[PDB]
């Protein structure tokens, strides 16, 4: 989900964009500013929440030794889902 | 007699090769470093340290890194006692200041004070 500027400059996923009166836009003159078109914040928002029937859940990121360290997520709160601190996947209790 | 008498103060600033504006314009600080409040260990507060004042750091125009022009920015020296640090600073021609070591005064600890009969030091819970 890239965004443009009134200058015409692309805005990175960290929110950086050179100012209109900034002199450092001259480095892109005759060249291009490289940005990543895949925004991870927008990409992790499309993952559906996983519904489980336990009070706690365990996440390793998938793949076992190829993922993140295994963490345990509590699902006692009903107002919010339980997000994994590493991979960003969220879980919800079935009840 | 193979042993001559020199009654002058020890000064070696003409041999170290340091430029003069890094000698006459620098303030050395001699101090015992404070214990980090995030930890209860006291092994880092045993030795005296001498360091220098922080000069200007600016931003790189290309990448935004931290650029400096001070060669003494990372110079930290370790001494066992205060007088060794004082003599090392005075030998090298650095104007220095000294901060006294701060030690924790002893406390009076009693587990039975948590359940006093008539004193305010009772604990509301445990």
């Amino acid at each position: 989900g890239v965004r443009t500027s009134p200058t015409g400059e692309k805005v990175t996923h960290t929110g950086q964009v050179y100012d209109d009166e900034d002199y450092r836009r001259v480095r892109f003159v005759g060249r291009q500013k490289e940005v990543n078109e895949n925004f991870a914040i927008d990409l992790i928002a499309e993952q559906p929440v996983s519904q489980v029937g336990s009070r706690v859940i365990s996440c390793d990121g998938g793949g076992g030794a190829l993922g993140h360290p295994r963490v345990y997520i509590n699902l006692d709160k009903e107002t919010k889902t339980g997000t994994c601190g590493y991979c960003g996947l969220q879980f919800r209790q079935q009840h | 007699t193979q042993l001559i008498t020199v009654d002058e103060k020890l000064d070696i600033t003409t041999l170290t090769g340091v430029p003069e504006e890094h000698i006459k314009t620098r303030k050395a600080r001699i101090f015992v470093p404070a214990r980090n409040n995030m930890q209860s260990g006291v092994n880092n507060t045993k030795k005296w340290k001498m360091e220098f004042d922080t000069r200007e750091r600016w931003e790189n125009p290309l990448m935004g890194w931290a650029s400096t022009a001070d060669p003494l920015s990372n110079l930290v020296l370790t001494f066992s006692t205060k007088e060794d640090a004082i003599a090392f600073a005075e030998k090298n021609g650095w104007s220095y200041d000294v901060e006294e070591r701060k030690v924790p005064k002893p406390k009076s600890k009693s587990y039975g004070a948590n359940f006093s009969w008539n004193k305010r030091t009772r604990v509301s819970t445990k």
Binding site: - | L3, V6, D11, T14
Partner: protein, 114 residues
């Protein structure tokens, strides 16, 4: 308070050694200018030699000035033989270095350095 001497027992022989080193440098300056094809005159080289000796002229310890004479002798031997290039000889003259301001007002204008 008794210390082991290096070469000089007291200040007189140390001053003699300083005198001899200055004489040797003063003699070699024209040959250094000619052999290295320097852009300076002989007078500028001799003024630089005198300036270094005058800069280093506030010392009263015989061992310190003995070490200073020793290091000057090493530099002179390093220059007599062609071991230094033209850049090492010309590094005494800071031609490309910008003039550092000295008064308070200009230092206040240019930055935070005292």
């Amino acid at each position: 308070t008794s210390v082991k001497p290096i070469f000089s027992r007291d200040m007189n022989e140390a001053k003699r050694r300083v005198r001899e080193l200055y004489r040797a440098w003063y003699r070699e300056v024209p040959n250094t200018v000619h052999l290295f094809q320097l852009d300076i005159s002989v007078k500028q080289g001799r003024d630089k030699v005198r300036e270094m000796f005058k800069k280093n002229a506030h010392v009263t310890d015989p061992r310190v000035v003995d070490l200073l004479v020793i290091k000057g002798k090493m530099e002179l031997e390093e220059t007599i033989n062609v071991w230094k290039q033209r850049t090492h000889v010309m590094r005494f003259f800071h031609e490309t270095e910008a003039p550092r301001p000295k008064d308070f007002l200009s230092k206040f204008y240019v930055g935070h350095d005292p």
